[PDB]
Amino acid sequence: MKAVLFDIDGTILTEEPLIMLFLPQVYDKLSRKLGISKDEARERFLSEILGRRDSYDWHDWNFFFKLFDLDLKYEELLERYPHKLQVYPDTIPTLEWLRDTGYKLGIVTSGPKYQRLKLKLTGLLDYFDVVITRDDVNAIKPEPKIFLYTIERLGVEPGEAVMVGDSLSQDVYGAKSVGMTAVWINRNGDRGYNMADYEIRTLYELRKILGGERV
Numbered sequence: 001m002k003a004v005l006f007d008i009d010g011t012i013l014t015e016e017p018l019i020m021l022f023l024p025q026v027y028d029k030l031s032r033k034l035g036i037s038k039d040e041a042r043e044r045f046l047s048e049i050l051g052r053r054d055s056y057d058w059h060d061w062n063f064f065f066k067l068f069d070l071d072l073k074y075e076e077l078l079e080r081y082p083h084k085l086q087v088y089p090d091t092i093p094t095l096e097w098l099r100d101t102g103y104k105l106g107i108v109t110s111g112p113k114y115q116r117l118k119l120k121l122t123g124l125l126d127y128f129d130v131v132i133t134r135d136d137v138n139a140i141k142p143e144p145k146i147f148l149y150t151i152e153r154l155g156v157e158p159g160e161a162v163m164v165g166d167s168l169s170q171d172v173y174g175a176k177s178v179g180m181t182a183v184w185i186n187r188n189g190d191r192g193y194n195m196a197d198y199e200i201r202t203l204y205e206l207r208k209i210l211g212g213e214r215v
Contacts, residue, residue, distance in 0.1 A: 001181065002156045002215055003104035004206070005147075006128075007165030008115055011185055012091045012203070013122055018084035022077050029070055054169075056140055059110040075114045082121035088187075094203040095127040102215040104154045107131040108147060108163065110140035110170060130154050141167070142174025151180075162210070164203070172196045183209070 006012055023042075030041035049064060057063040061074040078085070098105060105128045109115045113135040119125040132150045139146045151161050158179035165171025166185050172195050175182040184196035185203065192199050198209050 001103070001162050001210060002160040003106060003151065003154050004098055004162045004164065004210075005106040005108050005150060005154075005175075005180075006163075007141075007167065007171050008107060008109045008111065008118065010166040010187065011164060011171075012095075012124060013085055013087045013118065015085055015118065017086055018077065018081055021081060021084055022072075026065075026070065026072065029072065030068060033069070056134070059134060059140060060112045062112065062114075075117060078114060078117055078121060085118060085122050087122050087124065088203065090203040091124070094206055095124070097207060099127060101210075101212070104129050104156060106150050106154050106161075107133075108141065108150050108165075108171075110134050110146075141165075141170035142177060144174075144178045147174055147178045147180065162206075164200075164206070168193060168195055 009015060026045060027038045027041040030036070030045060031038045034041065045064070045068065048067060052058045065072040065074070095105065107119065107128050107130070109132070111133055113133050115133045116125065116131050119128070119131065125131070130150055130153045132146060134140050137146050137149050147163070148158070151158060154161070162181045162183060163171055163175030164183045164185055166187065168184065172182040172184050182196050183198045183200060183206070184192060185200050186192060187201060200206065
């Protein structure tokens with residue numbers, strides 16, 4: 001292998017603490033604007049998210065802010081609360097090891113351009129040779145284009161690339177469909193359906209999968 005490609009959310013970092021922080025503020029502003037309770041505001045907001053699952057806009061917090069005509073921009077939330085972004089303990093030792101061993105490193109995410117800001121604010125950006133988001137290619141996983149465009153910029157063939165992500169449909173199916181090796185990271189004891197070439201609980205397991213030889 002020559003390159004390892006990564007999803008962001010759930011794979012190298014989580015934005016869950018930030019989400020737990022801003023959602024009450026969304027419900028507050030929704031309650032004010034629409035003249036409903038904060039409980040009803042939560043119901044409507046979460047409903048719309050659930051209703052857009054698997055669509056292009058599903059992965060964009062700004063889509064939902066704008067849907068409800070809120071004066072909220074996720075990029076501003078990110079800049080304001082960058083410590084609420086949590087890097088997994090296994091991430092940086094793995095990125096360092098892959099970089100040291102000679103692998104090209106890519107990001108492939110269905111999230112929009114603020115995904116790149118998340119990497120900058122967590123100090124992860126500089127590890128990667130290429131970062132592709134939905135906004136760069138106007139496509140989401142598992143569309144072949146978002147994968148192919150990434151390995152094209154990395155200068156590698158599909159069969160020389162490994163994809164790591166936590167989504168069976170986006171990451172594993174997406175990567176396998178263009179001829180990549182597909183690794184599923186399963187942090188929460190979920191069901192794998194026998195799909196991925198490898199299943200891991202932690203990014204550290206890549207060392208024994210890839211072996212130690214330089215590339």
